[PDB]
Hints:
The structure is cut from a larger assembly and holds 1 copy of chain A (417 residues), 2 copies of chain B, 1 copy of chain D (117 residues) and 1 copy of chain E (220 residues).
Chain A: H1 3-15, E1 26-27, E2 37-38, H2 85-99, E3 106-109, E4 112-118, H3 124-132, H4 137-146, E5 162-169, E6 176-184, H5 185-199, H6 214-219, H7 232-237, H8 240-243, H9 251-261, H10 279-291, H11 308-326, H12 334-337, H13 339-344, H14 346-366, H15 373-385, H16 396-412
Helix pairs in contact in A: 1-2, 4-5, 5-10, 9-10, 10-16, 11-14, 11-15, 11-16, 14-15
Chain B: E1 8-19, E2 39-42, H1 44-59, E3 69-70, H2 86-96, H3 98-102, E4 105-106, E5 115-116, E6 120-122, E7 125-130, E8 134-140, H4 146-149, E9 154-172, H5 174-178, H6 184-195, E10 208-219, H7 228-233, E11 235-239, E12 253-257, E13 264-268
Antiparallel strand pairs in B: 1-9, 1-10, 2-7, 4-5, 6-9, 7-9, 8-9, 10-13, 11-12
Chain E: E1 4-13, E2 24-25, H1 32-42, E3 48-57, E4 62-71, H2 80-84, E5 92-93, E6 100-121, H3 131-144, E7 161-164, E8 180-189, E9 195-202, E10 207-208
Parallel strand pairs in E: 2-6
Antiparallel strand pairs in E: 1-6, 1-7, 3-6, 3-10, 4-6, 8-9
Amino acid sequence: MILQALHGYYQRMSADPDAGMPPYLCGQCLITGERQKPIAQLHPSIKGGRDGVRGAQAVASIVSFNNTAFESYGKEQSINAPVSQEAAFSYVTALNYLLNPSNRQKVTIADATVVFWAERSSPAEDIFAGMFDPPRMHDLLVAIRSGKRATDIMPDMDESVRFHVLGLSPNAARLSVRFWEVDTVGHMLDKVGRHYRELEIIPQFNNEQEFPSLSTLLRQTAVLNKTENISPVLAGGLRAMLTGGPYPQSLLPAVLGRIRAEHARPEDKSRYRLEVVTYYRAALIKAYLIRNRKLEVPVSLDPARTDRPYLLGRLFAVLEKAQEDAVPGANATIKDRYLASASANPGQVFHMLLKNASNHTAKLRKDPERKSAIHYEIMMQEIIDNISDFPVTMSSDEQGLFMIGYYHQRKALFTKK
Amino acid sequence: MTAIANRYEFVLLFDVENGNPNGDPDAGNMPRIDPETGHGLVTDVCLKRKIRNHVALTKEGAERFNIYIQEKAILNETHERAYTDAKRVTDWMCTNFYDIRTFGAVMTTEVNCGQVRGPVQMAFARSVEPVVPQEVSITRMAVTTKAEAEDNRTMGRKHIVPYGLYVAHGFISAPLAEKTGFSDEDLTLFWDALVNMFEHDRSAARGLMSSRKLIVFKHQNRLGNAPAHKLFDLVKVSRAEGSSGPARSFADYAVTVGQAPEGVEVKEML
Amino acid sequence: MTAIANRYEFVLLFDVENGNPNGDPDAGNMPRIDPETGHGLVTDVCLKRKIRNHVALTKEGAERFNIYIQEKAILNETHERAYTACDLKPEPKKLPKKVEDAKRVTDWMCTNFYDIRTFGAVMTTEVNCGQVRGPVQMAFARSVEPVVPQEVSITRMAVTTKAEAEDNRTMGRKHIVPYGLYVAHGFISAPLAEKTGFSDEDLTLFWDALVNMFEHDRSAARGLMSSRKLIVFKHQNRLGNAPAHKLFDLVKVSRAEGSSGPARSFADYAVTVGQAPEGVEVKEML
Amino acid sequence: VSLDPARTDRPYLLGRLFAVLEKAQEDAVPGANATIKDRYLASASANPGQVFHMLLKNASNHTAKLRKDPERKAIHYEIMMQEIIDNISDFPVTMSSDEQGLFMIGYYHQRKALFTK
Amino acid sequence: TYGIRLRVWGDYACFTRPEMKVERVSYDVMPPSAARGILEAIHWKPAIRWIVDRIHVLRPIVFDNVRRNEVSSKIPKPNPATAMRDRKPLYFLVDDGSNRQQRAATLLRNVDYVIEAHFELTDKAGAEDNAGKHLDIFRRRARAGQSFQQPCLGCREFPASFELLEGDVPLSCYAGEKRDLGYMLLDIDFERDMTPLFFKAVMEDGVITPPSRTSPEVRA
């Protein structure tokens, strides 16, 4: 549909006296299907930049045939896409109207700018801006995550109204449709609820929101936690949000690689040494494991799990806690160096980690804290009791479970003692 | 000159070791990963580019083997041509440009609309099992601008696939060959290119790539004798018996070919 | 200077004892490893840097043997030299429209920068000088057996700034591989040498650099590194007579039968070189 | 119980032996500033062949001390050591990384068993 | 009785929408033009004309994104005689500045269709030409897995595995659903200077019933 839906949106908004604008060879128009209409040689341009598609040229466009390779059947310019001039103007005007940030129906996700609307006037149009990028909204989101109908928070919403989402990406003055969804407001609110239910994890710090933003989640996979370096394909695939389908298979390796390449950065002047397995990365891993792998993952530490990857993650967390207690103010921790290899090749490195932890607890048993020294040994003894061997290798899913276990055990030890 | 007389299908197994077989221009040049399965992906056009380069290097402007679609590997030493109204020019292009004769081309001509199809066809090549690319951080001594000079070092990154075995399928249509003169010597050159495709494509980013195995299904009849997808099934690629954990060499895989139908001959160029 | 006429492959074996052959910027400064298997890694750029350093040391900036990527060079300034030498004026981000002038600037870059002539270069900066692939290529070196990088903690009896830390001494730590044997593959392309002018003199200097690469790379972090075996496969004609992987398989590295426990010396390994195909000869004596 | 007394993997058995010696020492000298694990874990795993004999002399002294008073278990630990060593034909000169991981697993398994009521 | 049932499936497919041709966006389902192309790839002769009756969609509609380095322009038509009056090369440099064009593609994944079609004799048919003979020839080729060329799902890089269907069509994932896909392409009216013609596609129960592209009321 897409272009026809923008045409319908122009028809809808153009009827109203406000919040819109009324301005106005032969062939068959592919937008309306009308026969014998004046086809357009060149469509009106679409705004780029701040009031348009971020990253695109000021006069970007959707339909363009500026090179011969793009022309078929001897047709010239936009004759390759026969659309009546009025329909072309209407759809371009609708897209420009939505692209205007003054209208509250626009959001930017990494590379692409997303514009959404409904087939009829509905409060969902101004509501969904918060769903894709959370800042009464919190009550709606918590209700949706639990699966309740949105009408329970506001009966005014007719959930049967169909909702459109369009994702555009920039190029050298020509745009690409990265994704496109159409569904009833009720259905796609259910899928967003499913998504947030999957992402649910105990927060690491009280300043972290309970409904992480999509941009914040994606930024945590980028190379240096910046909007650029976000993989456009990964952002586009993570469509999985509001379609309910499996997350892209590259998501888990991306998060694992980001954990592998990260380390504590006091240079940010954050007095707490920044975590490598942050709240958002753990949330992403949990969501991937629940959806794609159909595993059971708790929101908080589960000491009755007894899964070997989960147990190994917990053991790593307790070893790191012992290191932190034994060496206060240490610049680096095993978190920065051995986290990747321990998860990917436990049988090769855990002996060294355990010997280092023995050294750490030996220091504690002499210094004050003479028995958190015994407590950490008890934790290690209890966790290892459920393990028969250190596996030589673990799959990506097992590494994700390792990360989740490490995150859960680490949080349980912040203020246990 | 006479075109080939049999339909062909071939399966090419190639691997990459600590390199980027094909970067993704939509993922910051990371190696392509299939979203649906997690398997590495290599587009057909990459392999076609490699074949074009190999043939250009090997024949270097011989009579019948000029390559039209060049990529700045050209050499202006010497050219010769056969010296043969749209049909005339089309046949002339086919008769002395190997890539046009093999893969086809599209000219800016009206009567036929430009369509020259060509017999050879290749599909996307995908890894046998999921790949986990590793990111490598590297530094450089020198800065490029005076502005950033004003402590003087820059840090970049490099994406590599630790190891991956890729399967590429292809089809050769004899009836199309009859319309462009793709002959048996061209077919032998094509097999040579496939088996030696990666030998001249060395670079800093690609690591070590090589062709491990090439199965060719030769059909008795001009058009086929069995469905192609059932022939591709005969090539079973599974992991060796004594190997566990992620694969790091071709020796970790076992590849076997089943018995083809009565109307098809199986040839193993590698 | 005539370019080389034959295709070459080669295999280099080098050691490290209580040293860090190549640190990892991400894992603190630990030696690079393959986290799935524990095998050590050394980037190609690391070895290329050592070859560059050896060339700079042995030629001392002699003519036709300058290094483009130097410690404190500013690349755009070097690009200006090519334009000045060829008498063109650089367009703001583009090569000269006259393709002959672009070729002239690129050749001037190649003709007197040894590392551009050998490993290629990307020079499409503001002062654009073009691109070069370079006949010589190297792959990541990979240890024959997994390496166990142990972490060493050290102290300094002095403080840098005004601080009341010393109560315990100032802390620091090294990372070392107790021992590891690394295998590096490489290729030399005659067709590309014909484009860059990589000559037989350059090839002999390159073999010399590989043989003596580590003898002048000593430092407090490197430990003891040495080149152990360099096997060179020379093809009979401009294009190869055999696949590269087939040749690399002739060099087999295994542990000597009398050795046990972790490897701690080159004597713990036995290296065997097989018979080359009919079109290739092995210059293993290097 | 998670300990496997029928496994008989030499690193596992050596880990169990280390755990029982540690228990014997901690029983014979309560309140000691450091367990034998802290003192000899590095040398024990690095060079098992040359240090386990020393550990066994020390454990013999500890068991002899235990045997003198009704707090005597000493028979229990002596039987455990005699049983575990029964399955060892020779001490390793060195242990691989995974072998040392199995050593630690066995030590932690045996230690918990001796903590049982 | 009459007509054909041909099942086609593949991992990838791209039936590019004409209005998003540069940055390719695929149709949700194969248009009848693609079905014609696939059928003709198995058997076609000038004496006979293919007509597509229905398309059955058997798998969920799943999209994906692939980006590739492509070329800007078609190669020019040469002058043979002028070409060797001098010893010179002829080429198109892909990576020479604007010659390189990067194009993204929003393309389908894991597709599966059943094509229902039948023949129709053209004015070029001889007296010996009859629809039944070509029908049986096509059936033989499809059963044996033979074809003039390997069919592709839109673009040649996406091969189409095919198989003649000799019974009832399998169940569709959209069996109980009515879905409107909007106006899409029927075919190109090659007789009328290649004028494209469009129809509004409804997908009740996963089966699309386009009008006959030879009908006078769909043609200009």
